[model samples]
Target: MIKLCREVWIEVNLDAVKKNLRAIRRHIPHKSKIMAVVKANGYGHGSIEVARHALEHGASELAVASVEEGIVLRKAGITAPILVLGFTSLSCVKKSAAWNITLSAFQVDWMKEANEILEKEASANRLAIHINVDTGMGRLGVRTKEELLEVVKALKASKFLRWTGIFTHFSTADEPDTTLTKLQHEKFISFLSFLKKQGIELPTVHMCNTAAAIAFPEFSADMIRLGIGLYGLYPSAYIKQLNLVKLEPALSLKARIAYVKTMRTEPRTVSYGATYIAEPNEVIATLPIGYADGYSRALSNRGFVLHRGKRVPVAGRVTMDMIMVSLGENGEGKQGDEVVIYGKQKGAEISVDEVAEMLNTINYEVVSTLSRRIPRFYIRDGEIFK
Candidate 1:
């Protein structure tokens, strides 16, 4: 077990990240490149480390959600192509261009604004861009061919802007039925063909997210933008059942038993509002993790943690900095004993998916919502990386 200075911390196995990327690479076509999506801090596993591991494995490019996220990678000394999947404001155009970070654009006016901004900066580097087509997601993209053409024409007209890629997002690639996904693919294909007919050809084209990348390999165009699966998570249960790609979870939440005490001879309650009545002589253990660390207050009285290969129940309401657990009358627990919040311990496991189910949410939220209060430790090749 790895020693930590903090009471609560998240351990990330970067080897699992590399192995997951290899698994994804094997699932997709050999010709299809990978653009590892590190948005949301690599889905809360720490983007810089995950990005480094991914690039070392098989990822050719990186994708984030905003200019801030892209700039983070650039500042971290990552020189790979970084594209912002979300909208980039005109005010950030110069900053993004200066860092060689690509921004996703779907509007002609936005490009016009960016071009004007770039003209004033007079930077040597041209602003790289990727055009998004709203096949069905309806988030950010051009819906009509005319709209796409105007954006493409604007790109051709601008000396400061360079079109690097064009892509679209599918709405239901995780669903068992691929009807909507295929329809979206057709629309994207139509737009691409329309642009080709107009004597415009983009350097790079991609549209397959993790789900499509795994389930529908043929739909993977020039590249696959792998997000959730790269972190060893399935997009949905349907995708899990598909079993096309084997994924090893990379992140684990852990903490040490801060204190352990036996209940008095007379039964007493635990935590705020006296919610849980503990049996006499019951072992009550307090953990350093709580709702403030993104453990979620909803887990109180419902969630279970692994202690010495045994499952212990949360005794009462989760406080901001601590949670009490009932370790049963005969449960063996001691101060500093390792507690697995959602991971493996002594061969027993409490998977992140289980925690997500307990929280009535998804695994992505369970990990991504983890607050920065909990420190992160990275492991590589069976050893902790400094």
Candidate 2:
């Protein structure tokens, strides 16, 4: 077992992760594929473990944000095809291609430059690339079908580069309306039409992100890139239709109570700013986790935790290394007792979704913000995977 110190740690339920993947797979047709997005260190859930588990489940491919991320997966022994979804310089892709990683062709000039690099390495052969057609996301990709077609033609004509996919991003697939997603879908259809008119077979079309996969399957092309949803998080609270499938959350945060103290005085202060006035006979439990540990400072008095199977409230300003919890009078918790920051504890649970709402943020940020300093323990088949 990995060391479980009292400072802070995370328990990752691998079985739940695979279950979520299976649940996502059930939504799409079997012929369609799943491109598991493991960027941002698998949304801060440890990229290597998550990527390995993703491939074991049924993900046809993997997508990341950079060549360096792709290299991390490769070094960790991920043999599955990986697509670098973000900007990658020509210098990196030259070595990245040999690393069995794919590149995204967002611009013609960029691809031409990459072509020059690959051309210099004839022995290295053509590099695999995906065409990122900007439909409406406004981040990356060719902004128009004309530019997209030009880039596609340019890559097809190049002997040093190969185009294997074409895709776009939906800015509002998580919302119930999907009006904007429809507009983007229309644009993607136009791009695909041009590809057909040019006598080119559709190269692994995909555009649906997590929210799109759950709420807008109609526009989901040959594959869906599952990001936050695969980790059992909906992209937005505005999309209630996503509740259609049961996505079991795979990550749970637990920190042992490092110290427990009984506050006897009425005017007791708590945390950084002395913002909390302790009630008479209030029992305060100090947690080792803080904003530096990824528990947001905004959660100050708003956040909740689980102690002795009951809801406990946080007190005062969240410090950089500690958070004080108010255990009311008659609280039976003692030092070294387990505390649930978020996740199932006894008869109840504190969800990541709840934490996000309290912080006026989204679930993605809630989980992704978790720091790497926390120890991660894995659970598989109802037991520790180790």
Candidate 3:
């Protein structure tokens, strides 16, 4: 759920994750593979737990942002091929071969340095690596055609490097407009064709991410990097508002009332700075969680929690360790009563995206920022497991 004995908790629906993976697979070709992005600690949904559940579904490979993340999965007995989709330190690059983890090598210098590292620690013939080309993202990767050509040549010449795959990122794949995304896709295809002209045989080429996979399945090259969508979080308005695909949320945040009582007196100020003034007799429920627990303070006045089949409005300023919710007169809620902070409850739901909108942020930030203090309970078929 994040802790074993805390009032606050996060429940991960493993079945929903499996369902989302299978549904995503339904849209792609049978030959194309899926690389589940369980990076950022599974987007703060518990990486190892989510990775195991994902493997049980349809994920062929796993993608992380760093070398340590890959090793964590490997040590967890995750046998699926893991791709460290970011630059690896020279020391880490040497161990990638031993751990059976792939890496992304875009710079000629990194390739040269990693080749040197791998040359000495040559337990294997070559270290598996992916070539990242920057078509329009302006991030990492070789930007120009000439620069990419040189990088490819360098990777080929390296004695301890194996060019296993090539992929790029789409800057606007999730946008409603497809003009820029299409151009970026064209540029990537052109570079692939360029490599072919130079008599360079590509291993596996993939460039579409979760958004690209949904909006442009034609560019499903070899694999799709399923990141946000894997966790059942939409990446953009086009995906969320457009009803792009049938996806189910896999996380449900809940809490138990730590302290609750009725404001029997009249005209009393509530919580920090007296932001809320009690008009008359009302029930107040204090949850044992706050901004320090990853429930943003921005949600202080805007947030609401579910209790007894009704929505409870936040009372006042969200403190570091507590938040008061107004339960109205005769609310019938008490201490130890279960409450839904961001999840379905009795036919009502408080979605992560909905909370994000309330906080003027994004869903990724919303879930990924949840502190580990809130124990994560994994559930399958309504049974709590890991």
Candidate 4:
């Protein structure tokens, strides 16, 4: 067994990641490029690692949520094209330009501000820009063709900005109803045609997110932004039903039993508020993970951990840094024994999807909420990265 620096740790299967991206590659059009979205720290699986793995597996570009995230990738010696998918501050224009990172632009005013900053600094590196048109997602980007034209004109006139791509987002791509998705797609295509009529053409045009890539591959114009799928997770259950590509989960949350005790003398209450009262001589094991580690306190008396292939119910409340599980009488549990929090163990499995159900949330929140305090170990082939 490999020694870990911490008892509670996360295991990331890079081999599974490789397979997942390959599966996506096989599913998409042969010519459609993939822009692996590494935002939110690769959906909390470690962006740098996930980005590198993705780039090696045919992802031609990377997308982050902020300039800092893009800079982090650049600092890691990643030279692939990286586009910030969200709003970027004008103060980071120099850094973004210096690092060769692309920024998503929606408003002409924001573009002018970035231009002023870049010109004032007299930076030689031109900031690459991707126009974000708001087709249906009212979050970011130009609302109409008029606003898009103004933004595009700004991109063309700016000396320090390089217009590289134009894209939009699908608000309801994951839904079973494709009405909104198709409407958004048509709107985006109309924008492209409008640009074409003006004799304006961008080098790259991308629109499909993970959900769109899986369910509507025909909409993958020039590239697809692979986000949740890169981490071996589907955007929605409906997407999973499409069966376009099989994804193997790459993350596992596990911990070791820190202590074990049996209340042989009398019945005792477990954890705070005395929610659970243990019977006489019942075995209870303490784990070093709790709500602070992204294990929700809601799992108080409902959650169960896999102990030696058997389900051990969580006793009482899930504390800040610890949780106790009932092992029952005659149960064999010892200190340093491995416990599966939400993963497979000895023919038993507690999947992330199951954890999401228990938490009344989605699978994305289940993994992304895991605190950084837990050390993450990567498995490549059969070897573990230290």
Best by TM-score: 1
Q: Which candidate number has the best lDDT?
A: 1
Model 2: which residue pairs collide? none
Ranking by TM-score: 1, 4, 3, 2
lDDT of 2: 0.84
**TM-score, candidate number 4:** 0.97
Q: What is the lDDT for 342 in model 2?
A: 84
67-151, model 4: which lDDT tens digit per residue?
Answer: 8888888888899999999988878888888889999988889889899889998845899999898998999989888788888
- Per-residue accuracy of model 1 over 36-150 as CA lDDT, tens digit each: 9999988999999999889999999999988888888888889999999998878888888888899899888998888988888795599999999999999999999998999
Q: Report lDDT (Cα) of residue 81, candidate 3.
A: 83
Steric collisions counted per model: 0, 0, 7, 0
Model 4, residue pairs in steric clash: none
TM-scores for all candidates?
Answer: 0.98, 0.95, 0.96, 0.97
Write down the lDDT that model 3 would get: 0.86
Alpha carbon lDDT of each predicted model = 0.90, 0.84, 0.86, 0.89
Worst ten in a row by lDDT for model 3: 1-10
RMSD of each: 1.2, 1.7, 1.8, 1.3
Provide the global lDDT of candidate 1 against the true structure: 0.90
